[PDB]
Amino acid sequence: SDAERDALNIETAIKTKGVDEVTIVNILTNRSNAQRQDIAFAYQRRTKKELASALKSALSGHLETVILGLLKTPAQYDASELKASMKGLGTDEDSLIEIICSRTNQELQEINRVYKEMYKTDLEKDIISDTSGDFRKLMVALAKGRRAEDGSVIDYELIDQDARDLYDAGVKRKGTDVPKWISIMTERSVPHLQKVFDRYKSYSPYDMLESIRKEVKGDLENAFLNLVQCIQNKPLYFADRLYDSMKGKGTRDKVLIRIMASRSEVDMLKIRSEFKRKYGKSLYYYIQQDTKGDYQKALLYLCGGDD
DNA sequence: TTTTT
Ligand SMILES: [Ca+2]
Ligand SMILES: [Ca+2]
Ligand SMILES: [Ca+2]
Ligand SMILES: [Ca+2]
Ligand SMILES: [Ca+2]
């Protein structure tokens, strides 16, 4: 791909009668995030106008949402989707939960950095202002992106202690020591907590998910359930969420666009394998059945192929 | 335009 050739073709398509939405999708959804930035700079040189702003005026509907997200860097997109979710008077806890629970340390520290630059306040402060209680404690801890990294020697002794501790703090006692749960689950490494969750099955008659459902409710319950899935198998999590966004009446397009756009160059192939092996048909197939038009062709290129 | 009541 030639960034200057693409910026030219995208300009010719914006200026074709009715807008040539097809050429725009073919290019942009078939280029890395770096190549999209290149195109966006080249466009700005040929025209002295921002690509993002020209496309907002040229497109509409779901297609516009997809393509303007694509034009953002990974940290910028996630940052913007965290602001969108915390905007207005209410909060979109689900979207918040999904982005925070599923981002790595490296991803979270750049999001924290870029969020400051775009919106002139700190992500933490914006989280504190829109969530309360233990759900705020959990979200604040997760968003620091400071969870311990995997050691070289497995720490079997602490795996057992942590599993015991999760149990003492929950299903065993009356009430719940929620901060014990927040500590263990925000601070320990992902490979470690994978082992904890299995060892926990040794003490408790319920597994980690059952125990969450039986111990807390509401946002806190959702925050912990998403978090355990992301620790256990992150591509499976995104496949399950992709399925939920499409399985019944209509489409939660917001979730479908966000996963396809943010996971396309990260783990889309792993997501597709889990979706196929659990649901029997491809992620590609569910997208084809649920959406129409340029919008559909856009999500399908992000998918990257039928399974 | 995108934040902000
Ligand atoms: Ca428009
Ligand atoms: Ca809000
Ligand atoms: Ca209890
Ligand atoms: Ca419950
Ligand atoms: Ca549907």
Author numbering: 33 to 339
Paper quotes:
Annexin A2 is a non-EF-hand calcium-binding protein that is characterized by the ability to bind and aggregate (i.e. ‘annex’) anionic phospholipid membranes. AnxA2 preferentially binds to phospholipids and other anionic polymers and does not contain any canonical RNA- or DNA-binding motifs. Importantly, AnxA2 was shown to bind phosphorothioate oligonucleotides and has been implicated in the release of PS ASOs from endo-lysosomal compartments in productive ASO cellular trafficking. In the present study, we co-crystallized the C-terminal domain (CTD) core of AnxA2 with a PS 2′-MOE DNA gapmer ASO and found that unique hydrophobic interactions between PS groups and lysine and arginine residues account for the enhanced affinity of PS ASO to the protein surface.
From our crystallization trials, we obtained two types of AnxA2–ASO co-crystals that were used to solve two structures referred to as structure I and structure II, determined at 1.9 and 2.4 Å resolution, respectively. In structure II, it contains two copies of the complex (complex 1 and complex 2). The major difference between the two structures is that the nucleic acid is bound by AnxaA2 using two different interfaces. In structure II, only a small single-stranded part that comprised three or six (for complexes 2 and 1, respectively) of 15 nucleotides could be built in the model. In this crystal, the electron density indicated the presence of double-stranded nucleic acid that was formed by ASOs from complexes 1 and 2. Because of low quality of the electron density maps for nucleobases, it was not possible to establish the register of the ASO in structure II; therefore, an arbitrarily chosen dT sequence was built in the model. In structure II of the AnxA2–ASO complex, visible nucleotides were located in the vicinity of loop AB of domain II. Notably, this loop is the equivalent of loop IIIAB, which binds the PS group in structure I. The PS linkage makes van der Waals contacts with side chains of K115 and K119. In contrast to the distorted trajectory in structure I, the oligonucleotide backbone that is bound by the protein in structure II adopts a more canonical conformation.
